[PDB]
Ligand binder design. Sequence first.
Ligand SMILES: Nc1nc2c(ncn2[C@@H]2O[C@H](COP(=O)(O)OP(=O)(O)O)[C@@H](O)[C@H]2O)c(=O)[nH]1
Ligand SMILES: *S(=O)(=O)c1ccc(S(=O)(=O)Nc2cccc(F)n2)cc1
Ligand SMILES: [Ca+2]
Ligand SMILES: [Cl-]
Ligand SMILES: [Cl-]
Length: 168
Amino acid sequence: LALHKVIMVGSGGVGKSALTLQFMYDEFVEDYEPTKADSYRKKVVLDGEEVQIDILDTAGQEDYAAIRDNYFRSGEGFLCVFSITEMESFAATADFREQILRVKEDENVPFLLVGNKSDLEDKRQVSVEEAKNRAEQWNVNYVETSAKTRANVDKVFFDLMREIRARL
Ligand SMILES: Nc1nc2c(ncn2[C@@H]2O[C@H](COP(=O)(O)OP(=O)(O)O)[C@@H](O)[C@H]2O)c(=O)[nH]1
Ligand SMILES: *S(=O)(=O)c1ccc(S(=O)(=O)Nc2cccc(F)n2)cc1
Ligand SMILES: [Ca+2]
Ligand SMILES: [Cl-]
Ligand SMILES: [Cl-]
């Protein structure tokens, strides 16, 4: 079976684990150890083809640059998550983008910009417009998600796998 290697990236508290665990276990997990990294594997049927998704839920603990680059080099697609309620996490997505591009050397690396916590509209700090503009500058798709309501959770994982399938 095709194995689609997905890596979750983004700064702390944006929803990397909550998104992963909603996708994996259909549960909104609000207390997942912030420093714990883990891998998840699931068989899924992608546009009628049984595939395996492998998700690396990164937690930012790896500080040795060669090892961080090794992890990114093994990834095939990236969900680059920020929280719409924390402007600084949106700014931080630029760094993850650059790190990925240095390692993958391919501006067309499968990559979604993911604005999570769409259920907290009253706390929004990042406008839809500015996130869409960034995605347009990078030529990536922008999707807003909620790990709490499940809004667009399957979409980001499936659409990323579709990009992996098409591009690699
Ligand atoms: N309301 C809301 N809270 C969220 C959402 N995603 C994550 N959270 C909360 O934000 C906190 C950090 O989420 P987590 O997934 O652990 O962030 P990570 O550090 O990026 O893995 C937790 O308390 C989650 O319950 C969301 O979509 N909506
Ligand atoms: S390794 O398997 O021992 C490992 C994997 C992930 C992490 S992390 O998620 O805590 N930090 C990190 C940062 C950047 C990329 C990446 F894959 N992981 C630590 C050790
Ligand atoms: Ca986490
Ligand atoms: Cl791991
Ligand atoms: Cl939150």
